């Protein structure tokens, strides 16, 4: 399966099969580092804590707004009712009713805006569950930084944590490159890969991993002559048909 996912990012599967223990060890060490980094950093889950903090703060503000007068003589209904007849108590309780109705309407409006934001975040989380966990994504930075291999979901309080396993290239080397190879008056182009050279010798390799190979007629295809391509390089293209001929 992970050889298939290596094929999905442009690396041949023999790279995985010849490095299976190393890839497994790197995956295990990365999962253990994820466990340690989540156990150490206190502000790692601040996105989920902010939702709980905002909801609790909104409810406590709604409770605390019952102490306001809103232009009336008091904030307690029972103190108004025990000092006034039904007409002036009607006036003061009308002021309190208008103020508390305004407080409730403000709370409901802010909750609607916050719920729209939470719904957008949940639609994004459902899209990431569909495209990162249930498949392999070619979208850049949608499922982590690097070439995405696979993702794993974890439940969290009011949320989801995605563990994105990605492939990162490392230990680059610079080589001399050419667009085409001129062998017999014909221009040769790589079928998949890139011509590279160590100054003296020319090979064709895959683009995301250094694996040099002898430039043959099976590695390359022919298009035109050596007069159109700018930067074409003279080299020999080996023919496998006539050592055995």
């Amino acid at each position: 399966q992970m050889a298939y996912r290596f094929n999905g990012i442009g690396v041949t599967q023999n790279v995985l099969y010849e490095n299976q223990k190393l890839i497994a060890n790197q995956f295990n060490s990365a999962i253990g580092k994820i466990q340690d980094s989540l156990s150490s950093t206190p502000s790692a889950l601040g996105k989920l804590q902010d939702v709980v903090n905002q909801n609790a703060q909104a409810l406590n503000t709604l409770v605390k707004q019952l102490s306001s007068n809103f232009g009336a003589i008091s904030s307690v209904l029972n103190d108004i009712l025990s000092r006034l007849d039904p007409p002036e108590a009607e006036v003061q309780i009308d002021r309190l009713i208008t103020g508390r109705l305004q407080s409730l309407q403000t709370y409901v409006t802010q909750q609607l805006i916050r719920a729209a934001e939470i719904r957008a975040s949940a639609n994004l989380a459902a899209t990431k569950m569909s495209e990162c966990v249930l498949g392999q994504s070619k979208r850049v930075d949608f499922c982590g930084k690097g070439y995405h291999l696979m993702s794993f979901p974890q439940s969290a309080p009011h949320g989801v944590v995605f563990l994105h396993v990605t492939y990162v290239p490392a230990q680059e080397k610079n080589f001399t490159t050419a667009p085409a190879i001129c062998h017999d008056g014909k221009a040769h182009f790589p079928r998949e890969g890139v011509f590279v050279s160590n100054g003296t010798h020319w090979f064709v390799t895959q683009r995301n991993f250094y694996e040099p190979q002898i430039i043959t007629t099976d590695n390359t295809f022919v298009s035109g002559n050596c007069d159109v391509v700018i930067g074409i390089v003279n080299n020999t293209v080996y023919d496998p048909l006539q050592p055995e001929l």
Binding site: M2, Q20, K21, I23, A24, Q26, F27, N28, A30, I31, K33, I34, L38, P42, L45, L48, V51, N55, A56, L62, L77, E90, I97, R100, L101, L104, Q105, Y107, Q111, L112, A115, I118, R119, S121, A122, N123, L124, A125, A126, K128, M129, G144, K145, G146, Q154, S155, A156, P157, H158, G159, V160, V161, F162, L163, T166, V168, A170, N174, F175, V194
Partner: protein
């Protein structure tokens, strides 16, 4: 410079506030201007960490309308900063002040103000016949945390506005379907939270089980697979995530912010 017509005494602004007047003894036109102007912000590294603060005065040019001057003053495009030293190095942003200026608390400890650094400089060795190809790789696992739902709340309007008062309830009846509207909105939010959770998590309809022998070619999923020993069948990572987030209350247990 206003020229009043002879029947006029006061001049008004676009907000209908009196901003011009005619002096009744010497007939000259005066412009009235408010005294208070300019916003003020305060910068602290935490009251637990220290007691010194820095004060940012917006709309103040120090090349004054300040509370107290100090030993170090600094003129940013966000205003005049008093109480912070200006250094010439560039770091990452600790406390954002504005206009490319950030502040931090460095060691004798004091608040330093600096221009933020966008990152380390890099120059790719571009040539017209040179390529760079990786010879190795790293397998990297990164976390992404996404909110899905929030708490579903319901409000009894009569108990909030007119709690255990009959006269207030009979007065609240003369406002109409406002509280029915509020409860309808909150019910829609509460239904939407369950819809959000169902859309994120209930993608598959079969409950798949891992095999009892965990031979996966060397790959170890023990930190993300469920732990059968725990009373809650969660992964170790999931148990850590549930411990790291802090979220029936009877009448007899109440008679507390939730109460």
């Amino acid at each position: 410079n206003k020229k009043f017509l002879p029947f006029q005494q006061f001049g008004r602004d676009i907000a209908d506030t009196t901003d011009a007047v005619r002096d009744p003894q010497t007939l000259e036109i005066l412009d009235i201007t408010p005294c208070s102007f300019g916003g003020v912000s305060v910068i602290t590294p935490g009251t637990n960490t220290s007691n010194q603060v820095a004060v940012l005065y917006q709309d103040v040019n120090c090349t004054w309308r300040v509370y107290s001057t100090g030993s170090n003053v600094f003129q940013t495009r966000a205003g005049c900063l008093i109480g912070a030293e200006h250094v010439n190095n560039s770091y990452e942003c600790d406390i954002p002040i504005g206009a490319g200026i950030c502040a931090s608390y460095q060691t004798s400890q004091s608040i330093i103000a600096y221009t933020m650094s966008l990152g380390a400089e890099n120059s790719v060795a571009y040539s017209n016949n040179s390529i760079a190809i990786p010879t190795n790789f790293t397998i990297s696992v990164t976390t992404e945390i996404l909110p899905v739902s929030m708490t579903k709340t319901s409000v009894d309007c009569t108990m909030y506005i007119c709690g255990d008062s009959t006269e207030c309830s009979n007065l609240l009846l003369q406002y109409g379907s406002f509280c029915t509207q509020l409860n309808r909105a909150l019910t829609g939010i509460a239904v939407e939270q369950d819809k959000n959770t169902q859309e994120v998590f209930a993608q598959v309809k079969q409950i798949y089980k891992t095999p009892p022998i965990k031979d996966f070619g060397g790959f170890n999923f023990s930190q993300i697979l469920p732990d059968p020993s725990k009373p809650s069948k969660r992964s170790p990572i999931e148990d850590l995530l549930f411990n790291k987030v802090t979220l029936i209350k009877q009448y007899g247990d109440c008679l507390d912010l939730i109460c």
